[PDB]
Structure formats: structure tokens, C-alpha cells
Amino acid sequence: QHLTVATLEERPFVIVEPADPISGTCIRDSVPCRSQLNREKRCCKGFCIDILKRLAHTIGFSYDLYLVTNGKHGKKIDGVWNGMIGEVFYQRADMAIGSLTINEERSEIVDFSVPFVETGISVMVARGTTVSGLSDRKFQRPQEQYPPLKFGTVPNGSTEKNIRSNYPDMHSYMVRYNQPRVEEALTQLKAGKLDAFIYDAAVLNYMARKDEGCKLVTIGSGKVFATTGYGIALHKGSRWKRPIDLALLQFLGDDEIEMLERLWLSGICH
Numbered sequence: 001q002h003l004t005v006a007t008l009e010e011r012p013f014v015i016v017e018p019a020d021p022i023s024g025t026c027i028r029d030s031v032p033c034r035s036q037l038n039r040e041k042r043c044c045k046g047f048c049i050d051i052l053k054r055l056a057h058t059i060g061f062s063y064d065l066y067l068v069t070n071g072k073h074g075k076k077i078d079g080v081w082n083g084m085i086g087e088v089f090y091q092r093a094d095m096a097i098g099s100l101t102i103n104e105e106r107s108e109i110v111d112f113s114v115p116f117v118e119t120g121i122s123v124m125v126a127r128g129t130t131v132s133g134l135s136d137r138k139f140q141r142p143q144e145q146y147p148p149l150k151f152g153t154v155p156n157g158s159t160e161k162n163i164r165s166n167y168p169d170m171h172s173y174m175v176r177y178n179q180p181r182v183e184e185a186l187t188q189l190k191a192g193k194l195d196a197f198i199y200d201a202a203v204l205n206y207m208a209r210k211d212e213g214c215k216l217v218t219i220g221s222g223k224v225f226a227t228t229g230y231g232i233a234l235h236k237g238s239r240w241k242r243p244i245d246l247a248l249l250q251f252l253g254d255d256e257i258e259m260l261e262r263l264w265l266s267g268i269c270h
């Protein structure tokens with residue numbers, strides 16, 4: 001009846017802010033979240049946090065929410081998982097929720113809920129920049145061009161895993177252009193230091209919709225990469241999967257998720 005929940009900041013799905021200075025509490029639509037390093041203070045809000053609030057209410061559990069510091073979403077290195085996936089896999093958390101992408105590798109070792117956000121991989125470029133998309137040889141045969149195209153991703157997640165598995169030559173080229181967070185990637189794109197940023201589609205599309213001046217645009221990967229979704233990670237064989245799935249499927253049909261997309265993921269640019 002009390003669940004430990006791991007999450008990770010990735011705006012606008014999970015947004016972290018200090019407690020209200022005046023009250024010392026998390027006000028508005030925010031909820032208390034602590035750091036993995038530790039153990040109000042910090043407070044979390046956003047699309048995934050609203051999902052979590054509704055699940056807790058509908059299913060009837062209480063929870064302790066914490067932010068992962070041991071890596072990010074989840075990466076397996078030399079036999080060991082880090083990030084949100086590792087927290088669930090090693091049973092430090094009963095579930096993990098955030099912008100967490102379902103893939104085959106992860107699905108082998110944790111159970112996921114049904115997907116509640118559609119995503120995949122997209123490419124973001126400055127509106128001026130002329131490429132056709134991820135099929136462009138500027139991407140696919142990157143060192144065939146005299147001044148080479150500069151393109152990168154934020155490493156360690158499902159995006160990099162997909163590129164390394166399916167397009168190993170392109171992946172090897174991208175390594176020098178790894179970015180530490182989406183915020184720095186966007187900054188490099190705008191400074192011309194990158195020509196393109198390849199990343200999670202749900203996040204990139206949102207960033208395009210919110211770009212001041214609407215100067216950043218995304219191209220869908222088309223057939224280059226498959227579509228997938230965000231899912232809540234749970235212990236393999238978790239008793240929580242079924243009630244969570246039922247709730248999520250209910251939210252979908254009630255237009256509750258659609259409402260939350262409007263609330264959190266809308267922007268001015270189109």
C-alpha cells in the first residue's frame with residue numbers, strides 16, 4: 001500500500017523546483033521529492049507527476065518519490081544497470097515513472113505498464129538548415145562530406161542504444177557530438193555548433209513547439225526508426241502492473257491523458 005517511486009527530471013514530463021520559500025512547502029500542483037543521494041525540500045511537477053498523482057488516487061496507494069542520481073533513464077554497462085531501470089531492477093524502487101522509453105533490452109528485465117505517451121526518435125534542426133531527414137546521406141554517410149555534418153544525441157539512453165544497434169557507422173560518428181542534457185544540445189544547435197540533434201521524439205517535438213521565435217524544427221525519423229512509448233517500469237512479475245494498466249487505460253478513455261497533453265505539452269509553434 002506504500003510504494004517507493006523513482007523518477008528523473010526531464011521537462012516537461014518531470015520538472016523539479018525548490019520548495020516555496022515562504023511556506024517551505026510544495027505548493028500548487030507539485031509534490032515532495034527527495035534526491036537519491038539523500039537518504040518538501042525539492043518539489044516535482046509535470047505530465048508524469050500528474051499521472052502518478054492520479055494513479056495513487058485511483059488505485060489507492062501512498063508513495064515516496066525520489067530523483068535518480070545514479071545515471072539517468074537506464075543503461076547497462078558491463079553487466080550492471082544504472083538509472084531508473086536499475087532502481088527498479090535491483091528492487092530499490094517499486095516503480096519508476098518519467099519519460100522512460102520502452103525498449104526490448106529493458107523489457108527483458110523489468111515489466112512495463114502499457115505505454116501512455118507515444119514516442120520514438122526525431123531530428124531537430126534550425127529552420128534554415130536543409131536536410132531531408134534521417135535518411136539523408138549527410139547523416140548516413142557522415143564522413144563522405146568535406147565539412148562534415150555535426151550531429152549528436154544525449155548518450156546512454158534508448159536513442160543512443162537504437163542508433164548503435166541499427167546504424168553502427170552513424171553511431172560511431174556521433175560520439176564526439178554527445179551532449180550532456182537537452183538544454184545544452186539546444187544551445188549548441190542555436191549556436192551552430194551542432195547542425196542537428198537526434199533525440200526522443202516526445203521531448204523534441206515539445207521543444208520545437210516551445211522554441212522562442214519558432215526557429216527550431218523537428219523532422220520525424222519516418223521508417224529510419226520505429227515508434228515506441230513511455231511506460232512505467234515495475235519489478236518483473238509485479239503485482240502492480242495490472243491495476244496500473246487498468247487505471248491508465250481508463251485515463252486514456254476518459255480523455256484524462258488527452259487533457260494532460262493539452263495542459264503540459266502544448267506550445268505556440270507549429
Ligand SMILES: N[C@@H](CC(=O)O)C(=O)O
Binds near residue numbers: 099101157199
Ligand atoms: N526517454 C529515453 C531517453 C533517450 O532516448 O536517451 C530513455 O528512456 O532512454
